[PDB]
Write a protein that binds this ligand. Sequence first.
Ligand SMILES: OC[C@H]1O[C@H](OC[C@H]2O[C@@H](O)[C@H](O)[C@@H](O)[C@@H]2O)[C@H](O)[C@@H](O)[C@@H]1O
Ligand SMILES: OC[C@H]1O[C@H](OC[C@H]2O[C@@H](O)[C@H](O)[C@@H](O)[C@@H]2O)[C@H](O)[C@@H](O)[C@@H]1O
Lengths: 142, 142
Amino acid sequence: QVASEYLGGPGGDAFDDKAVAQNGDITRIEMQCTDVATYIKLRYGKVDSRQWGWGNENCIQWSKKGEKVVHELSSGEYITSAIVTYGKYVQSITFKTNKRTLPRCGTSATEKSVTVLIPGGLKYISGRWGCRIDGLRFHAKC
Amino acid sequence: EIASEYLGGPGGDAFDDKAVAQNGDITRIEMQCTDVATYIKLRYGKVDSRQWGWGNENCIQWSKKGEKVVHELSSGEYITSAIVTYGKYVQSITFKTNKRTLPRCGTSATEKSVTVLIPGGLKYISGRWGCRIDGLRFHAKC
Ligand SMILES: OC[C@H]1O[C@H](OC[C@H]2O[C@@H](O)[C@H](O)[C@@H](O)[C@@H]2O)[C@H](O)[C@@H](O)[C@@H]1O
Ligand SMILES: OC[C@H]1O[C@H](OC[C@H]2O[C@@H](O)[C@H](O)[C@@H](O)[C@@H]2O)[C@H](O)[C@@H](O)[C@@H]1O
């Protein structure tokens, strides 16, 4: 499908939820959130992706950890906007759906900012990960 | 049925290319470009819309005119995203296709920017126009 630019840095390892996303529309957003977003894990239909981020509890050597944040999406709800601040890593993520605006994951929003609009709803994400979210790319439905 | 938010201001007159777009897939982008974009005019198959912007030469009282740019799309090329900078008016537009990033229409600016994904490729545009492009909305094929 159509996809955004890659937003972030060259670290970590690549991930791509294309296949897992064939299980269904995004139904849930799970993230780990402190002054930065340290992982993301979407649910596609009934099937969670892997935890993309916070690879190891010893990641606490290099960033804060944060708290788990869960956003359950209702039937027919889809992500239509992502505001990302990023540099070497993704710093913060603000999602908005066709039904509501979700709180920012990552209280600091000082890095370069980009707003990606996804008419019809986000289908899935790809990017890079390790102890944090090194970068993200947003994929539309066609 | 999939369409972006409207990006721009309340001035000008509404336009909508839904009917003329029945003439075919977009084959050409014509714009007029100075420091800002002053009109847009897509070609649907063989058929142009009316010129959306630079209503008449008196508009030189309020902004520069600019020069005509034409991007010819090859068969099978479709517009997959647009980076739009806007406020009261559309300031600049950078179109991207499945094959290439195209030149921006308009130069650098301080206004708000968004990246619009256009799932399945752009079908047609709507918006508002007068002396320039008051706003744009992207209607996708998905
Ligand atoms: O996902 C971010 C980052 O995770 C891993 O690196 C963790 C830290 O390793 C230290 O050696 C380094 O000084 C820190 O900057 C790193 O955050 C992973 O190896 C790396 O590729 C990822 O970018
Ligand atoms: O599409 C831009 C604009 O075109 C027309 O207005 C031209 C200018 O008129 C002046 O009176 C005004 O002070 C300027 O801001 C305008 O650019 C049109 O009438 C208007 O609706 C459109 O917004």
